[PDB]
Amino acid sequence: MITVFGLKSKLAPRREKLAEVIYNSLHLGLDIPKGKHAIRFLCLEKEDFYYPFDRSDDYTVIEINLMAGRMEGTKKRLIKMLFSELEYKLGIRAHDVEITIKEQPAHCWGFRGMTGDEAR
Amino acid sequence: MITVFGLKSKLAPRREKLAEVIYNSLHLGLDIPKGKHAIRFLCLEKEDFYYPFDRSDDYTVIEINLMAGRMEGTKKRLIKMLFSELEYKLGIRAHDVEITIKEQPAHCWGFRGMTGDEAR
Amino acid sequence: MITVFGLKSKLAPRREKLAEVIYNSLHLGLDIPKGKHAIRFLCLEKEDFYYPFDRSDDYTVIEINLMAGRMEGTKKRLIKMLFSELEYKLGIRAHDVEITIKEQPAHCWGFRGMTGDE
Ligand SMILES: N[C@@H](CCC(=O)O)C(=O)O
Ligand SMILES: [Cl-]
Fold first, then answer.
1. Which of A39, A55, B73, B91 has a C-alpha 20 to 30 A away from that of B25?
2. Are A116 and A80 in contact (CB under 8 A)?
3. Ligand 1 test: best mutation among A2, A22, A26, A36, most atoms within 8 Å of CB?
4. CATH of domain A1-120
């Protein structure tokens, strides 16, 4: 599952589009078909979000979990794509975007009654 | 800490039983005593949960964090048991569950004042 | 992003002192200037927080995400400094504190339009 964190005031009305944008970059960048992944939104109240001092209220954190296996370039590509999509499609400046890809071996994944190393 | 993510209407009512099942499979499958582990539940509002298109409102994500060291087979067993247990006790179709085990080096953990590598 | 999880009744009044302490340990332990990292708080309802049964409702979990690279002893320092700070400055006993440092390769990070390895 992918999670997007942000101040509720700014993130709340941006949900549908951020989902479309991520589903787009996952497809276009990793060939994962749209809707294949779960996407969650966490809308923060002001007092819970201490974003970095030099950033703005649009500060958006994206956590992406993948089964380990891809090349660094492919991972870098999705990060660059995500920045572009956010800038040109939501007005969120790369400045205010933070992203992290977390990977775990296939055998640490479980979906559809199977472990990931056994999915075929 | 282990986190369970699910849609509020479906997850809230099952909170108590899921903790038992998780404590049960942690105990039963890894030897961790009913309650040595923190378990958190995050109840999502519908607008915040884009589970995979073709799944149901019963979609439940489980994130499990452990100190590294167990063998691959041990971790698969845990995932496998969690699938069975949630099927039989909660009636959650395995197709509706996603699980990921995240592991971190012992020295990256902290509990009861020590670093994980120092413990006992 | 670093996240701090705790019972809302105990965590909410602690947020500011808690951010200061994390910024302080990150600066002294890792040389990271205050305010460079985002800190998030997740205030829990009693119903959602099954902390271990022999623990107390002060139970606090801290997840720290770092770009891989630092030395093992540095990571350990940071953890030990955080136990100090929280107990002696917030009164939260080290037994009621769980911490985990999660590291990802620089190429897995993205900020200010760049990837961490760039
Ligand atoms: N969303 C899962 C795959 C789920 C499925 O195969 O049904 C992943 O991160 O790989
Ligand atoms: Cl969360």
1. A39
2. no
3. A36
4. 3.30.429.10
